[PDB]
């Protein structure tokens, strides 16, 4: 930083004028800001019995169908659109639901399961090792934990935790915490 009179140019001017596109890249990347998904405006239109505002937009038969699945009162008409959904106008599918799901309201939270992803690991690593599927892999964990303590099985198998396998189990640094955890208390 010489010359000491430079009318500080913004992040972008520096980049572009000098022409280093990786600076240009961090700069552009700055606007990444990605969400959208007005899906609930369509969904809430079907609950609260309001004006459509559609076919102009991008409709997910699955988003809607699934969002409505949250509420037992809708199921009869969500189900109907299941067996019959394929081959309905993206629009027809919206016209039905509107003429089907009677009351309206919903607050957000969708149902997801509990994953002890310690436990998800142990099961996928039995499933891989023995080329058996998940339900059997289960029986496996039990008769090992029950008898043979399966530290040994965990001991012999740890060898392949291959970090790509990890890409299948969970999505983040919690993954890198497992990388260590199975490599540990056997």
């Amino acid at each position: 930083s010489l010359f000491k009179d430079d009318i500080q140019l913004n992040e972008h001017q520096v980049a572009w004028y000098s022409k280093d596109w990786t600076a240009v890249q961090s700069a552009a990347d700055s606007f990444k800001e990605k969400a959208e998904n007005e899906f609930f405006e369509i969904i809430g239109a079907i609950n609260n019995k309001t004006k459509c505002s559609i076919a102009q937009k991008d409709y997910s038969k699955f988003m809607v169908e699934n969002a409505l699945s949250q509420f037992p009162e809708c199921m009869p008409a969500v189900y109907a659109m299941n067996l019959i959904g394929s081959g309905l106008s993206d629009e027809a599918h919206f016209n039905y639901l509107m003429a089907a799901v009677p009351r309206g309201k919903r607050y957000g939270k969708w149902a997801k399961l509990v994953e002890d992803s310690t436990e998800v690991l142990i099961i996928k690593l039995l499933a891989k090792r023995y080329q058996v599927n998940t339900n059997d892999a289960i029986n496996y964990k039990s008769i090992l934990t029950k008898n043979g303590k399966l530290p040994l099985v965990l001991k012999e198998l740890k060898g392949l935790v291959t970090d790509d396998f990890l890409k299948e189990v969970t999505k983040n640094v919690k993954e890198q915490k497992q990388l260590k955890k199975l490599a540990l208390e056997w």
Partner: protein, 305 residues
């Protein structure tokens, strides 16, 4: 008796080596020996449907007894591009040893597998000299017809009153010798013959039962069932996507375990409710949701304590 001495799970290290060691009924053992007789194997489908009968075992065996160069693959893992890349890399390849190449696909009656199965129609024909395929199934109809045509379909189980007694005799004598090898002790000889009678058709279970008293060395549908009793949704709605994988199996284990846990007139309904849900599966767009609609339907009408 065979032992695989690097393995840690009973049922996996005592798996019968030969088409002999296996306990089977009459036309079953004959028909298997008659096959290995010809020294080259045709295409074959094997199915129980009553599990733990030896399906997956008899496959690895028929291969062994032919000195087959055998590639074992789980069905769940047999995706479209698995077939394209390895399984083709396999059956395209000639062998030095000049054996028959054989591909066992264990439990191919799963779901996404559907489009794979169609790839094979013209594959099983295109290398029909080199190699052949052995397929395992709990439910046949889950194997598309044009495969059933290419394959010889043998169907297990259902032994005679005679086969029964002899097989039970064999299984007991078999368990013993395993206890000898493992260093487990037999305190009584009625406990052994209990085990064999108890779960009879299922020999895998009966070896799995034994791997559970063995801490000492001597002689999961609960989550859904509990949520159905409690008649809640947030939990049921959450469990649906879990079993969306094999729907065909889950529906079975459900009809099995609810039948005991619910009232008599509620038994007649659970069949109407699950029976219908089963019919329309595969028409149903979202399998996960169509499974939810079953859970709700049950929690309401199913009544018991």
């Amino acid at each position: 008796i065979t032992v695989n001495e690097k393995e840690h799970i009973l049922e996996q290290k005592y798996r019968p080596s030969t088409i002999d060691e296996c306990i089977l009924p009459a036309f079953d053992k004959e028909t298997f020996k008659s096959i290995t007789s010809k020294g080259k194997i045709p295409h074959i489908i094997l199915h129980s449907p009553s599990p733990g009968t030896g399906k997956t075992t008899v496959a690895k065996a028929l291969c062994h007894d032919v000195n087959a160069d055998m590639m074992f693959v789980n069905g769940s893992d047999c995706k479209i591009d698995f077939v394209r890349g390895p399984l083709t890399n396999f059956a395209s390849a000639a062998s030095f040893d000049g054996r028959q190449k054989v591909i066992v696909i264990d439990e191919f009656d799963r779901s996404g597998l559907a489009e794979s199965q169609r790839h094979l129609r013209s594959f099983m024909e295109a290398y029909s000299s080199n190699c052949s395929i052995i397929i395992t199934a709990n439910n046949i109809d889950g194997i598309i017809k044009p495969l059933q045509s290419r394959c010889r379909v043998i169907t297990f189980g259902q032994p005679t009153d005679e086969d029964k007694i002899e097989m039970m005799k064999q299984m007991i004598r078999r368990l013993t010798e395993i206890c000898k090898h493992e260093g487990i002790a037999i305190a009584d000889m009625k406990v052994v013959a209990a085990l064999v009678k108890k779960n009879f058709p299922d020999f895998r279970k009966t070896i799995g039962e034994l791997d559970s008293y063995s801490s000492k060395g001597v002689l999961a549908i609960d989550d859904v069932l509990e949520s159905l009793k409690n008649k809640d949704v947030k939990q049921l709605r959450a469990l649906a996507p879990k079993y969306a994988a094999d729907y065909s199996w889950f529906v079975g284990k459900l009809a099995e375990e609810i039948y005991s846990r619910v009232t008599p007139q509620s038994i007649i309904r659970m069949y109407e409710i699950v029976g219908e849900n089963n019919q329309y599966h595969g028409i149903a767009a979202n399998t996960e949701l169509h499974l939810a609609y079953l859970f709700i339907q049950l929690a309401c009408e199913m009544q018991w304590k």
